[PDB]
């Protein structure tokens, strides 16, 4: 009895995108999953945060800041009712699956702005609650991309560099900050030279590895626990780690590398 | 510089933002050494961000099986472009400076900004399979990220919580600007904005405002060459071999997504080096 969210940024109903979603959604509930869709297009969904998020009375109309605004309004229960639907998904929900195309490298600009309006502060972060600690820590997250360029052009060599840095900004800073556990990304290069018959086995194994998802072991980020979690230590990395830590040939992450090696594929394959 | 144009892109709503001060004092220097000065202000412009078959007021190649990169590059060619997106296009054309200023979202861009990207670098206009990188169109043009944060420098320096900067800004400026062929200018970073007090904010545009007078002499930001690798389907896009053997006793990689296994060069996207 889990509940399943899947978030879609595609426009196309003829969109390999859109097939992959509803191959998962297939998937987990002949598993027995509950599944809920937020489908960003389709819902004709706002990505531009504003003051008409806020439905109550500002606390300053003067000088207005969205991050103190939209907090209170969450608090006093002021925010625009489309972004309170989304946050009540996301509270019901276990996984969470992004399906989307890489576009400039990077999320459509349609699911940064559902990122930026419904992931609101005490909702879904605090000064306090950040990374393992976070308020999703029980959730599980996983990004499902497709690329027109090929996998040897976001290899180490590869003229566009290291797909492993791509996804940090969005697995580290968006997903992993708010507390998800985040599971290996699925990855679908060159969809565009991939014939009919190769689509159909991709959603199979799509299909077949969500049957046992919920078993996988997540991605490694470095624990909060090795930093020192206040304004006047800077967050900075506790001293002691860093001792440990100064003579070891790889970094932690992609995002703590320390100047050292990267581990290998540390935002695509779990260490396991 | 005189007879020099720059374009300014905005991406936050209020007038009494910080962000908004940064882009007057930009304007302000900039027109005081003659420079002629354009702006888009998306919040002000109400900016449609979302890509659409809409963004082709023509005919559709093939409406059954919509698919906007192809459409959007044939609209372009063929003059059909949404005027919205044309008039973004002649600034940028006409441009040889392109400075943003916004405020890090969700570690980037604010998707108001995000969106401007994906309905104005159109295919053909802005990249090509074949020119790519230091060969792309915009390679006579120079770009500069000016951003602000909420949280202080320590936590984005190598031992802060949240990481390397360097990582965070990279899918940005290789991934969009210097993939148009952009020369690419250390960004202007403005951190812990809203913690800092009134008079350091003032000294803060006045380093920014005299940044600016000399902003076209800058070194630019060191990206690997394209020439470095083999720009063909069949070598899979991969650096040719022989680079490859000249790097194996190296340290350093070369750049944040061409690190290569090894040390990241220092400040690779925050600091030039000459
Ligand atoms: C603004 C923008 C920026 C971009 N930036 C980047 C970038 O930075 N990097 C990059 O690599 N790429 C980039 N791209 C390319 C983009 O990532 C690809 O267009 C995307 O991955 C294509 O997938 P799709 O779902 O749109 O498939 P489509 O091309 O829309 O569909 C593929 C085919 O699959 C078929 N199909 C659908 N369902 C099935 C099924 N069940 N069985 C069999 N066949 C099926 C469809 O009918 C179609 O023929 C960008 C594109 C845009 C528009
Ligand atoms: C959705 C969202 C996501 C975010 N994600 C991140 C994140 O990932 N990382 C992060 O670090 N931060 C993040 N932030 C915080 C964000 O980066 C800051 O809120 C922003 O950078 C502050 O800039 P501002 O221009 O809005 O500040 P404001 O609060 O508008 O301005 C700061 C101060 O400058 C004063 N000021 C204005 N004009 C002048 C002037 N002319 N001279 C002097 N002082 C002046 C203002 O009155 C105020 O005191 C996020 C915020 C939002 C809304």
């Known amino acids: 009895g889990r509940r399943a969210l899947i978030v879609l940024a595609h426009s196309e109903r003829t969109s390999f995108n859109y097939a992959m979603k509803e191959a998962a959604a297939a998937a987990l509930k002949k598993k027995g999953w509950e599944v809920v869709e937020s489908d960003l297009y389709a819902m004709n969904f706002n990505p531009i945060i504003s003051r008409k998020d806020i439905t109550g009375k500002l606390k300053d109309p003067a000088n207005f800041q969205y991050p103190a605004?939209?907090?209170?309004?969450?608090?006093?229960?002021?925010?625009?009712?489309?972004?309170?639907?989304?946050?009540?998904?996301?509270?019901?929900?276990?996984?969470?699956?992004?399906?989307?195309?890489?576009?400039?490298?990077?999320?459509?600009?349609?699911?940064?702005?559902?990122?930026?309006?419904?992931?609101?502060?005490?909702?879904?972060?605090?000064?306090?609650?950040?990374?393992?600690?976070?308020?999703?820590?029980?959730?599980?997250?996983?990004?499902?991309?497709?690329?027109?360029?090929?996998?040897?052009?976001?290899?180490?060599?590869?003229?566009?560099?290291?797909?492993?840095?791509?996804?940090?900004?969005?697995?580290?800073?968006?997903?992993?900050?708010?507390?998800?556990?985040?599971?290996?990304?699925?990855?679908?290069?060159?969809?565009?030279?991939?014939?009919?018959?190769?689509?159909?086995?991709?959603?199979?194994?799509?299909?077949?590895?969500?049957?046992?998802?919920?078993?996988?072991?997540?991605?490694?980020?470095?624990?909060?626990?090795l930093f020192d979690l206040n304004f006047q230590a800077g967050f900075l990395m506790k001293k002691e780690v860093q001792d440990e830590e100064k003579n070891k040939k790889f970094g932690l992450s992609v995002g703590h590398h320390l100047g050292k090696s990267i581990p290998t594929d540390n935002q695509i394959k779990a260490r396991k």
């Open 69 to 225: 605004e939209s907090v209170l309004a969450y608090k006093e229960g002021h925010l625009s009712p489309d972004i309170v639907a989304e946050q009540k998904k996301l509270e019901a929900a276990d996984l969470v699956i992004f399906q989307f195309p890489l576009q400039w490298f990077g999320v459509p600009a349609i699911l940064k702005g559902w990122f930026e309006r419904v992931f609101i502060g005490e909702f879904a972060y605090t000064y306090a609650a950040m990374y393992d600690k976070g308020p999703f820590r029980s959730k599980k997250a996983v990004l499902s991309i497709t690329t027109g360029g090929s996998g040897s052009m976001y290899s180490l060599q590869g003229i566009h560099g290291d797909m492993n840095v791509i996804l940090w900004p969005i697995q580290s800073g968006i997903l992993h900050f708010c507390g998800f556990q985040v599971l290996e990304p699925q990855l679908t290069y060159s969809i565009g030279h991939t014939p009919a018959d190769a689509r159909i086995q991709i959603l199979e194994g799509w299909k077949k590895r969500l049957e046992n998802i919920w078993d996988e072991t997540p991605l490694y980020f470095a624990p909060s626990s």
